[PDB]
CSV table of C-alpha atoms in Angstrom, one decimal:
chain,number,residue,atom,x,y,z
A,1,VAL,CA,-37.1,29.8,34.5
A,2,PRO,CA,-35.3,31.2,37.9
A,3,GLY,CA,-34.3,28.5,40.9
A,4,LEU,CA,-37.6,29.5,43.1
A,5,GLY,CA,-39.6,26.8,41.1
A,6,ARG,CA,-37.1,24.0,42.8
A,7,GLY,CA,-38.0,25.2,46.1
A,8,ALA,CA,-34.4,25.9,47.3
A,9,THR,CA,-32.7,29.1,48.9
A,10,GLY,CA,-29.1,29.7,50.7
A,11,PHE,CA,-27.7,28.2,53.7
A,12,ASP,CA,-19.8,38.6,39.2
A,13,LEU,CA,-18.0,38.4,42.9
A,14,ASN,CA,-16.8,34.5,41.9
A,15,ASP,CA,-13.4,34.1,43.6
A,16,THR,CA,-11.9,32.7,40.2
A,17,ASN,CA,-12.8,36.2,39.2
A,18,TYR,CA,-11.3,37.8,42.5
A,19,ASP,CA,-7.9,38.0,43.3
A,20,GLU,CA,-5.9,39.4,45.7
A,21,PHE,CA,-3.8,41.8,43.4
A,22,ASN,CA,-6.0,44.3,41.2
A,23,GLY,CA,-9.1,43.2,43.4
A,24,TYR,CA,-11.6,41.3,41.2
A,25,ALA,CA,-11.2,41.2,37.5
A,26,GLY,CA,-13.7,42.8,35.0
A,27,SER,CA,-14.4,46.5,34.5
A,28,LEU,CA,-16.1,48.9,36.9
A,29,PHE,CA,-17.8,51.2,33.7
A,30,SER,CA,-20.1,49.2,31.7
A,31,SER,CA,-19.1,48.9,28.3
A,32,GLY,CA,-22.4,50.1,27.5
A,33,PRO,CA,-22.8,53.6,27.7
A,34,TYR,CA,-20.4,54.5,24.7
A,35,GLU,CA,-21.0,56.8,21.8
A,36,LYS,CA,-18.6,58.7,19.0
A,37,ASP,CA,-17.4,61.0,21.6
A,38,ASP,CA,-16.1,58.1,23.1
A,39,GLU,CA,-14.6,57.0,20.7
A,40,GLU,CA,-12.5,60.1,19.8
A,41,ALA,CA,-12.0,60.6,24.1
A,42,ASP,CA,-10.5,56.5,23.9
A,43,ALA,CA,-8.7,56.7,20.7
A,44,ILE,CA,-6.5,59.8,22.3
A,45,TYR,CA,-5.9,58.2,25.2
A,46,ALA,CA,-4.8,55.0,23.1
A,47,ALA,CA,-2.9,56.7,21.2
A,48,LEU,CA,-1.2,58.8,24.4
A,49,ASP,CA,-0.5,55.3,25.9
A,50,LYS,CA,0.8,53.9,22.8
A,51,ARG,CA,3.1,57.0,22.2
A,52,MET,CA,4.7,56.7,26.3
A,53,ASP,CA,4.9,52.8,25.6
A,54,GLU,CA,7.0,53.1,23.0
A,55,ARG,CA,10.5,53.8,24.8
A,56,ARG,CA,12.0,50.6,25.0
A,57,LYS,CA,9.1,48.7,23.0
A,58,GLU,CA,11.2,47.7,20.1
A,59,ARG,CA,13.9,46.0,21.7
A,60,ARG,CA,11.6,44.5,24.5
A,61,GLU,CA,9.5,42.8,21.8
A,62,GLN,CA,12.3,41.9,20.1
A,63,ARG,CA,13.7,40.1,23.1
A,64,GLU,CA,10.3,38.5,24.1
A,65,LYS,CA,10.3,36.7,20.6
A,66,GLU,CA,13.4,35.6,21.0
A,67,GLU,CA,13.0,34.3,24.8
A,68,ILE,CA,9.5,32.6,23.2
A,69,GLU,CA,11.4,30.9,20.5
A,70,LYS,CA,13.5,30.0,22.7
A,71,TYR,CA,11.3,28.2,25.2
A,72,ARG,CA,9.5,26.4,22.4
A,73,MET,CA,12.6,24.0,22.6
A,74,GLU,CA,11.6,22.9,26.1
A,75,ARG,CA,7.4,23.6,26.2
A,76,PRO,CA,5.9,21.7,23.5
A,77,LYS,CA,2.1,22.3,24.3
A,78,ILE,CA,0.0,19.1,25.0
A,79,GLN,CA,-1.8,19.7,22.0
A,80,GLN,CA,1.7,19.7,20.1
A,81,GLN,CA,2.3,16.7,21.7
A,82,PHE,CA,-0.2,14.9,19.8
A,83,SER,CA,-0.6,17.2,16.9
A,84,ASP,CA,1.6,14.8,14.7
A,85,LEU,CA,-0.2,11.9,15.7
A,86,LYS,CA,-3.4,13.9,15.4
A,87,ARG,CA,-2.4,14.9,11.7
A,88,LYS,CA,-2.3,12.0,11.0
A,89,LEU,CA,-4.6,9.9,12.5
A,90,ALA,CA,-7.3,11.7,10.3
A,91,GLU,CA,-6.1,8.7,7.3
A,92,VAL,CA,-8.0,6.0,9.0
A,93,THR,CA,-11.0,5.6,6.8
A,94,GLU,CA,-14.7,5.5,7.9
A,95,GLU,CA,-14.4,1.6,8.0
A,96,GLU,CA,-11.5,1.6,10.1
A,97,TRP,CA,-13.2,4.7,12.4
A,98,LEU,CA,-15.8,2.3,13.1
A,99,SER,CA,-14.5,-1.8,13.1
A,100,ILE,CA,-12.7,0.1,16.7
A,101,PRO,CA,-13.5,-2.9,19.2
A,102,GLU,CA,-14.7,-2.5,22.5
A,103,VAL,CA,-12.2,-2.6,24.9
A,104,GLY,CA,-13.9,-4.7,27.2
A,105,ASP,CA,-12.4,-7.8,24.8
A,106,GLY,CA,19.0,-14.2,11.8
A,107,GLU,CA,16.8,-13.5,14.8
A,108,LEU,CA,18.4,-12.8,17.9
A,109,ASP,CA,18.2,-15.8,20.6
A,110,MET,CA,19.8,-13.6,24.0
A,111,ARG,CA,18.2,-16.8,26.1
A,112,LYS,CA,20.1,-19.1,23.8
A,113,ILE,CA,24.3,-17.9,25.3
A,114,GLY,CA,22.9,-17.4,28.9
A,115,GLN,CA,22.1,-21.4,28.6
A,116,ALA,CA,25.1,-22.1,27.3
A,117,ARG,CA,26.8,-20.4,30.0
A,118,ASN,CA,24.9,-22.0,32.9
A,119,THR,CA,25.4,-25.2,31.1
A,120,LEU,CA,28.9,-25.0,31.1
A,121,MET,CA,29.4,-23.4,34.5
A,122,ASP,CA,27.3,-26.5,35.7
A,123,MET,CA,29.1,-29.1,33.9
A,124,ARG,CA,32.9,-27.2,34.9
A,125,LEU,CA,31.4,-27.1,38.6
A,126,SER,CA,30.2,-30.9,38.6
A,127,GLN,CA,33.7,-32.0,37.5
A,128,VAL,CA,34.8,-30.0,40.6
A,129,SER,CA,31.8,-31.5,42.7
A,130,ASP,CA,33.0,-34.9,41.2
A,131,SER,CA,36.1,-34.6,43.7
A,132,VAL,CA,34.6,-34.0,46.9
A,133,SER,CA,35.0,-36.8,49.8
A,134,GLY,CA,31.6,-37.8,51.4
A,135,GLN,CA,28.8,-35.4,50.0
A,136,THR,CA,25.8,-37.9,50.8
A,137,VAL,CA,22.5,-38.4,49.5
A,138,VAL,CA,19.4,-39.6,50.1
A,139,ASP,CA,17.4,-41.4,47.5
A,140,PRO,CA,13.8,-39.9,46.9
A,141,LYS,CA,12.7,-43.8,46.0
A,142,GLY,CA,13.7,-45.0,48.8
A,143,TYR,CA,12.3,-42.7,51.2
A,144,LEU,CA,9.2,-42.6,49.8
A,145,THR,CA,8.7,-46.3,48.9
A,146,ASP,CA,9.7,-46.6,52.9
A,147,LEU,CA,7.6,-43.9,53.8
A,148,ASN,CA,4.3,-45.8,54.6
A,149,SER,CA,6.7,-48.3,56.0
A,150,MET,CA,5.1,-46.9,59.6
A,151,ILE,CA,2.0,-45.2,58.5
A,152,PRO,CA,-1.0,-46.8,60.4
B,1,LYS,CA,-18.5,-3.6,39.3
B,2,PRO,CA,-22.1,-2.4,41.4
B,3,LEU,CA,-21.9,-0.8,44.8
B,4,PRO,CA,-24.8,-2.6,47.7
B,5,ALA,CA,-27.4,-0.1,48.2
B,6,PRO,CA,-27.4,1.3,51.8
B,7,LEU,CA,-30.3,-0.5,53.3
B,8,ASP,CA,-30.3,-2.7,55.9
B,9,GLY,CA,-32.6,-5.0,58.0
B,10,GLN,CA,-36.3,-4.3,58.6
B,11,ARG,CA,-37.0,-5.4,61.9
B,12,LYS,CA,-36.3,-8.6,64.2
B,13,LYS,CA,-39.2,-11.0,65.1
B,14,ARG,CA,-37.2,-14.5,64.9
B,15,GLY,CA,-35.1,-16.2,67.1
B,16,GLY,CA,-34.2,-19.8,68.5
B,17,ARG,CA,-33.6,-23.1,66.4
B,18,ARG,CA,-34.0,-20.9,63.5
B,19,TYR,CA,-32.0,-18.2,63.7
B,20,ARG,CA,-30.0,-18.8,67.1
B,21,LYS,CA,-27.6,-21.8,65.4
B,22,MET,CA,-26.0,-19.3,63.3
B,23,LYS,CA,-25.2,-16.7,66.1
B,24,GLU,CA,-24.0,-20.2,67.9
B,25,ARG,CA,-21.8,-21.7,65.0
B,26,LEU,CA,-20.4,-18.5,62.7
B,27,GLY,CA,-21.0,-15.8,65.5
B,28,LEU,CA,-20.9,-17.9,68.5
B,29,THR,CA,-20.8,-16.6,71.6
B,30,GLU,CA,-17.5,-15.7,73.1
B,31,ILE,CA,-16.3,-15.3,76.8
B,32,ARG,CA,-17.7,-12.2,77.1
B,33,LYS,CA,-16.0,-11.6,80.5
B,34,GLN,CA,-12.3,-11.7,81.9
B,35,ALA,CA,-11.4,-10.1,78.8
B,36,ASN,CA,-13.9,-6.5,78.9
B,37,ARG,CA,-13.4,-5.7,82.3
B,38,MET,CA,-10.1,-3.5,82.9
B,39,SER,CA,-10.7,-3.7,87.0
B,40,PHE,CA,-9.6,0.4,87.5
B,41,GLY,CA,-8.1,0.0,90.9
B,42,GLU,CA,-5.9,-2.3,90.3
B,43,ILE,CA,-3.1,-3.5,87.4
B,44,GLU,CA,-3.2,-7.3,86.7
B,45,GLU,CA,-0.4,-7.1,83.4
B,46,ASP,CA,3.0,-5.5,83.6
B,47,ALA,CA,3.1,-1.8,82.9
B,48,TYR,CA,4.0,-2.5,79.1
B,49,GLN,CA,3.2,-6.0,78.6
B,50,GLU,CA,0.4,-5.1,76.3
C,1,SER,CA,-13.7,13.7,28.9
C,2,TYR,CA,-16.5,15.0,32.3
C,3,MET,CA,-18.6,11.9,31.4
C,4,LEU,CA,-21.0,13.2,33.6
C,5,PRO,CA,-23.5,15.2,31.5
C,6,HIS,CA,-23.2,19.0,33.3
C,7,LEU,CA,-26.8,20.0,32.8
C,8,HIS,CA,-26.3,23.8,31.1
C,9,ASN,CA,-29.8,25.4,32.0
C,10,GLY,CA,-30.2,26.3,35.6
C,11,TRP,CA,-33.8,25.3,35.3
C,12,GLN,CA,-32.8,22.1,33.8
C,13,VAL,CA,-30.4,21.5,37.0
C,14,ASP,CA,-33.4,22.6,39.0
C,15,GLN,CA,-35.7,19.9,37.3
C,16,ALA,CA,-32.6,17.4,37.4
C,17,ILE,CA,-32.7,17.9,41.3
C,18,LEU,CA,-36.8,16.9,41.2
C,19,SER,CA,-35.9,14.3,38.4
C,20,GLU,CA,-34.5,11.9,41.1
C,21,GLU,CA,-35.7,11.2,44.6
C,22,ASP,CA,-34.8,7.5,45.7
C,23,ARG,CA,-30.9,8.4,44.9
C,24,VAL,CA,-28.5,11.3,45.7
C,25,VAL,CA,-28.3,13.7,43.2
C,26,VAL,CA,-25.2,15.8,43.3
C,27,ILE,CA,-23.8,18.8,41.3
C,28,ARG,CA,-20.7,20.2,40.7
C,29,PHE,CA,-20.8,23.6,40.4
C,30,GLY,CA,-16.6,24.0,39.5
C,31,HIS,CA,-16.1,26.0,36.3
C,32,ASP,CA,-14.2,23.0,34.2
C,33,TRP,CA,-11.4,25.4,33.6
C,34,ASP,CA,-9.9,25.0,36.8
C,35,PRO,CA,-7.4,22.4,37.8
C,36,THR,CA,-9.2,21.7,41.0
C,37,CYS,CA,-12.4,21.0,39.2
C,38,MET,CA,-10.2,18.6,36.8
C,39,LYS,CA,-9.5,16.5,40.3
C,40,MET,CA,-13.0,16.9,41.4
C,41,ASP,CA,-14.2,15.7,38.0
C,42,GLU,CA,-11.9,13.1,38.1
C,43,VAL,CA,-12.8,11.8,41.6
C,44,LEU,CA,-16.2,11.4,40.5
C,45,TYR,CA,-15.2,9.7,37.5
C,46,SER,CA,-13.6,7.1,40.0
C,47,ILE,CA,-17.2,6.7,41.7
C,48,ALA,CA,-18.6,6.9,38.4
C,49,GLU,CA,-19.8,3.6,37.8
C,50,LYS,CA,-19.6,2.8,41.9
C,51,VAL,CA,-22.5,5.3,43.5
C,52,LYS,CA,-24.1,5.2,40.2
C,53,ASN,CA,-26.9,2.5,41.7
C,54,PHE,CA,-27.2,4.7,44.5
C,55,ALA,CA,-26.3,8.0,43.0
C,56,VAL,CA,-26.9,10.5,39.6
C,57,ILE,CA,-23.5,12.9,40.2
C,58,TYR,CA,-24.2,16.0,37.5
C,59,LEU,CA,-21.9,18.6,36.7
C,60,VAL,CA,-22.5,22.3,36.4
C,61,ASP,CA,-20.5,25.4,35.4
C,62,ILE,CA,-21.0,28.6,37.1
C,63,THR,CA,-20.4,30.5,33.5
C,64,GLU,CA,-23.4,28.8,31.8
C,65,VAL,CA,-25.7,28.6,34.8
C,66,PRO,CA,-25.2,31.9,37.3
C,67,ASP,CA,-28.2,31.5,39.3
C,68,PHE,CA,-27.0,28.7,40.9
C,69,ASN,CA,-24.0,30.9,42.2
C,70,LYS,CA,-25.9,33.7,42.9
C,71,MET,CA,-28.7,32.4,45.0
C,72,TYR,CA,-27.0,29.8,46.9
C,73,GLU,CA,-23.6,32.0,46.6
C,74,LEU,CA,-21.6,29.1,45.9
C,75,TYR,CA,-18.2,31.4,45.6
C,76,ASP,CA,-15.9,28.1,45.5
C,77,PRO,CA,-13.9,27.4,42.5
C,78,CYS,CA,-15.1,24.1,43.1
C,79,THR,CA,-18.0,23.3,45.9
C,80,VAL,CA,-20.0,19.8,45.9
C,81,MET,CA,-23.5,20.4,46.9
C,82,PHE,CA,-25.8,17.8,47.6
C,83,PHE,CA,-29.8,18.1,47.4
C,84,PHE,CA,-32.3,15.2,47.6
C,85,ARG,CA,-35.7,15.2,46.9
C,86,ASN,CA,-35.5,19.1,46.8
C,87,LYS,CA,-33.7,19.4,50.1
C,88,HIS,CA,-30.2,20.4,50.2
C,89,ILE,CA,-28.7,17.9,52.9
C,90,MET,CA,-25.7,19.2,55.2
C,91,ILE,CA,-22.8,17.0,55.6
C,92,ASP,CA,-21.0,18.1,58.9
C,93,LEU,CA,-17.3,18.3,57.9
C,94,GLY,CA,-17.0,21.1,60.4
C,95,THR,CA,-15.6,23.7,58.2
C,96,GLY,CA,-17.8,26.3,59.9
C,97,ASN,CA,-20.5,25.7,57.1
C,98,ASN,CA,-22.2,22.3,55.7
C,99,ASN,CA,-23.4,24.0,52.3
C,100,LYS,CA,-20.5,22.5,50.5
C,101,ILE,CA,-17.3,20.7,50.5
C,102,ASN,CA,-15.3,23.1,48.7
C,103,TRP,CA,-12.1,20.9,49.1
C,104,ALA,CA,-10.2,19.1,46.1
C,105,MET,CA,-10.9,15.4,48.0
C,106,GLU,CA,-8.7,13.3,46.2
C,107,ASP,CA,-9.1,10.1,48.1
C,108,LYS,CA,-12.1,8.1,45.9
C,109,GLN,CA,-12.8,6.2,49.5
C,110,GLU,CA,-13.4,9.0,51.2
C,111,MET,CA,-15.9,10.5,48.5
C,112,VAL,CA,-17.2,7.3,48.2
C,113,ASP,CA,-18.0,6.8,52.1
C,114,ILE,CA,-19.3,10.6,52.1
C,115,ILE,CA,-21.8,9.2,49.7
C,116,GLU,CA,-22.6,6.6,51.2
C,117,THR,CA,-23.3,8.6,54.7
C,118,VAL,CA,-25.3,11.3,52.7
C,119,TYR,CA,-27.2,8.5,51.5
C,120,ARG,CA,-28.1,6.9,54.8
C,121,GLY,CA,-28.7,10.4,56.4
C,122,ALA,CA,-30.9,11.7,53.6
C,123,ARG,CA,-33.0,8.1,54.1
C,124,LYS,CA,-33.0,9.0,57.8
C,125,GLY,CA,-34.3,12.3,56.7
C,126,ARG,CA,-31.9,14.0,58.9
C,127,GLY,CA,-30.8,17.6,57.2
C,128,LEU,CA,-27.7,17.7,58.8
C,129,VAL,CA,-25.7,14.2,58.4
C,130,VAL,CA,-22.7,13.9,60.7
C,131,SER,CA,-19.6,13.2,58.2
C,132,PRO,CA,-17.8,10.2,59.3
C,133,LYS,CA,-14.7,12.3,58.7
C,134,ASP,CA,-12.7,14.9,60.7
C,135,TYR,CA,-12.7,17.4,57.5
C,136,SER,CA,-12.2,20.5,60.0
C,137,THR,CA,-8.6,19.5,59.8
C,138,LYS,CA,-6.1,19.1,57.2
C,139,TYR,CA,-5.7,15.7,57.6
C,140,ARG,CA,-2.7,15.5,56.7
C,141,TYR,CA,1.0,14.6,58.6
D,1,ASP,CA,-22.4,14.7,23.3
D,2,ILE,CA,-18.8,14.4,25.5
D,3,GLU,CA,-16.8,15.1,22.4
D,4,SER,CA,-18.0,18.9,21.8
D,5,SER,CA,-17.9,19.8,25.5
D,6,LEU,CA,-14.4,18.5,25.8
D,7,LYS,CA,-13.3,20.2,23.1
D,8,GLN,CA,-14.7,23.1,24.3
D,9,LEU,CA,-13.0,22.5,27.7
D,10,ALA,CA,-9.6,22.1,26.0
D,11,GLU,CA,-9.9,25.2,24.0
D,12,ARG,CA,-9.5,27.2,26.8
D,13,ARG,CA,-6.8,25.6,28.3
E,1,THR,CA,42.8,1.1,79.2
E,2,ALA,CA,40.5,3.0,77.2
E,3,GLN,CA,36.9,4.5,77.1
E,4,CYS,CA,34.5,3.6,74.4
E,5,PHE,CA,32.6,6.3,74.3
E,6,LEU,CA,29.3,5.8,72.4
E,7,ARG,CA,26.1,7.2,70.8
E,8,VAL,CA,22.8,6.0,68.7
E,9,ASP,CA,23.6,5.6,65.0
E,10,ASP,CA,22.2,8.6,62.9
E,11,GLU,CA,20.6,5.5,60.9
E,12,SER,CA,18.8,4.2,64.0
E,13,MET,CA,17.8,8.3,64.5
E,14,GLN,CA,16.2,8.5,61.5
E,15,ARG,CA,14.4,5.0,61.6
E,16,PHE,CA,13.2,6.0,65.0
E,17,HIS,CA,12.0,9.4,63.6
E,18,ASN,CA,10.5,7.8,60.6
E,19,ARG,CA,8.3,5.5,62.3
E,20,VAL,CA,7.0,8.6,64.7
E,21,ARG,CA,6.5,10.1,61.5
E,22,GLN,CA,4.6,7.3,59.9
E,23,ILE,CA,2.5,6.6,63.4
E,24,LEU,CA,1.3,10.7,63.3
E,25,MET,CA,0.4,10.5,59.9
E,26,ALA,CA,-1.1,6.9,59.6
E,27,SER,CA,-3.1,7.7,63.0
E,28,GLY,CA,-6.1,8.6,61.1
E,29,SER,CA,-9.3,7.1,62.5
E,30,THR,CA,-7.3,5.1,64.9
E,31,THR,CA,-8.3,5.6,69.0
E,32,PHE,CA,-6.5,8.3,71.4
E,33,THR,CA,-5.5,5.0,73.4
E,34,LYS,CA,-4.1,3.0,70.1
E,35,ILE,CA,-1.8,5.8,68.7
E,36,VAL,CA,-0.9,6.3,72.6
E,37,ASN,CA,0.3,2.4,72.8
E,38,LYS,CA,2.0,2.5,69.2
E,39,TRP,CA,3.9,5.5,70.4
E,40,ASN,CA,5.0,4.0,74.2
E,41,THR,CA,6.0,0.4,71.7
E,42,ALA,CA,8.1,2.6,70.0
E,43,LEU,CA,9.8,4.8,72.7
E,44,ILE,CA,10.3,1.3,74.7
E,45,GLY,CA,12.1,-0.4,71.4
E,46,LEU,CA,14.3,3.0,71.2
E,47,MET,CA,15.0,2.9,75.1
E,48,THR,CA,15.5,-0.5,75.4
E,49,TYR,CA,17.6,-1.2,72.7
E,50,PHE,CA,19.7,2.1,73.3
E,51,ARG,CA,19.9,1.5,76.7
E,52,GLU,CA,23.3,3.9,77.6
E,53,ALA,CA,23.6,5.7,74.1
E,54,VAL,CA,20.3,7.3,73.9
E,55,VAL,CA,21.4,9.7,76.9
E,56,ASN,CA,24.9,10.4,74.9
E,57,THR,CA,23.2,11.7,71.6
E,58,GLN,CA,21.8,14.8,73.0
E,59,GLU,CA,20.1,14.9,69.1
E,60,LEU,CA,18.0,11.9,70.0
E,61,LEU,CA,16.9,13.3,73.5
E,62,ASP,CA,15.8,16.5,71.4
E,63,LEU,CA,14.2,14.1,68.5
E,64,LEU,CA,12.5,11.8,71.4
E,65,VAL,CA,11.2,15.5,72.9
E,66,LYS,CA,10.0,16.6,70.0
E,67,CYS,CA,8.2,13.3,68.7
E,68,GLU,CA,6.5,13.3,72.2
E,69,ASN,CA,5.4,17.0,72.0
E,70,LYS,CA,3.8,15.8,68.1
E,71,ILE,CA,1.8,13.1,69.5
E,72,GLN,CA,0.7,15.5,72.4
E,73,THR,CA,-0.8,17.9,70.0
E,74,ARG,CA,-2.3,15.1,68.0
E,75,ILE,CA,-3.9,13.8,70.9
E,76,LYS,CA,-5.1,17.3,71.9
E,77,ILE,CA,-6.3,18.2,68.0
E,78,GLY,CA,-8.1,14.8,68.4
E,79,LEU,CA,-9.8,15.8,71.3
E,80,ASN,CA,-10.0,19.7,71.4
E,81,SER,CA,-10.7,21.3,67.7
E,82,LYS,CA,-8.9,24.4,69.0
E,83,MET,CA,-5.1,24.6,70.3
E,84,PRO,CA,-5.6,23.6,74.3
E,85,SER,CA,-3.7,26.2,76.0
E,86,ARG,CA,-1.3,24.2,78.3
E,87,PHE,CA,-3.4,21.6,78.3
E,88,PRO,CA,-2.6,19.0,81.7
E,89,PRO,CA,-0.1,16.1,82.0
E,90,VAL,CA,-2.8,13.7,83.1
E,91,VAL,CA,-5.0,13.6,80.2
E,92,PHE,CA,-1.9,12.1,78.7
E,93,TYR,CA,-0.2,10.6,81.0
E,94,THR,CA,-2.4,8.8,83.8
E,95,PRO,CA,-2.3,4.9,83.5
E,96,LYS,CA,-4.6,2.8,81.2
E,97,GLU,CA,-6.0,1.7,84.3
E,98,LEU,CA,-6.8,4.6,85.4
E,99,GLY,CA,-8.5,5.7,81.9
E,100,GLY,CA,-5.4,7.6,80.9
E,101,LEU,CA,-3.6,7.3,77.6
E,102,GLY,CA,-0.5,5.7,79.4
E,103,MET,CA,2.2,7.5,77.6
E,104,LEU,CA,5.5,6.6,78.5
E,105,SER,CA,7.1,9.7,77.9
E,106,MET,CA,11.5,10.3,78.2
E,107,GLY,CA,10.5,13.9,78.3
E,108,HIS,CA,11.0,16.7,81.6
E,109,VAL,CA,7.0,16.7,81.7
E,110,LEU,CA,7.2,18.8,85.6
E,111,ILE,CA,4.1,18.0,87.5
């Protein structure tokens, strides 16, 4: 059924099928009307075109194949990317492929050397700081205890 | 995380000691004067006080 | 991906337009191959679970069902159009016409606001909903 | 469901 | 005994240009009055900080003129959809009390 049943109206000429160069895509001659004489004429035309295209065809093909091989080193397809994983991914069993939960639910002690160095530095500084002359200190015990000495 | 439907109030029929308390405490009435006038003739503040 | 179910049959799409009446129906006539339609589908997926309670967005492939691109004349690579209870609401984007969005809106908030405004206009019955946006320009600087 | 459509779209791109 | 020639540092001019670009880009749905006020604040800061050096740095004067032109173009686009052929400065440079945008510009906009 057409779209007229919905009662809608306006307000292969698609823009994707169209282009600046060579206009729109597709062939102006429908592929339907062919025949045996059409087959013979197409064969003759294709043979002539292939003959007229074989001047540098071998060297061009070899160079293009080498260039494609080179580009394969730096142009992995998205599919190729996950191809190695997708090949091994099939090894998951049916129980493994059904237990997938919903997403809604000696040794190196790196910090040890840092802590030791910090402790050594602090000890050395305190030894240096023990030579200070008049560094003051207000005892939190006294201040907190005497904080409520003027409270309402 | 749903989105509230695009619906608004139906009509207004109540007011005074039933809906006026909210409009007086929460949406309290501001000065509504000496802050919205512009005095297109004169210039009260400086040229770039902002 | 494209979690939004594309109505393959044209008559099925038309019935889907006649299916829901109390919400907003948005059909993405863009062909899923092109990257622009991919960005449109991503934007829809951003608002897939948000405007769901107020709208029902469906995808579409102009190659699958060509009647929509030949009667409504949706020639853009990915044109977003609306239809509310058998009434194609017009968004006042300001791009000369109002049948489609025609732009790959990469802002989810803008799409959500446009959907809300379209729903409000459809509730008010205005066939040409004033879009709260300056779509006539590129909105970039 | 969506797997077939996703595979179809991927195969053309 | 000497003469200390001064000029705005290129870092300051870059910061001013970045601020102008951000204000123009982040204008969005803000009213033209808000954009004009932001531009006036930026220009006031730039001119009051580099009081003297803003004249020697001809690059700074050119940047200020370009920024003013960009702000005026943005305001015109916000007002007129098309390109207005020489919109009057009265629309832009009129003070806020009179209803204008109240733009403070250091350009040679002859009335």
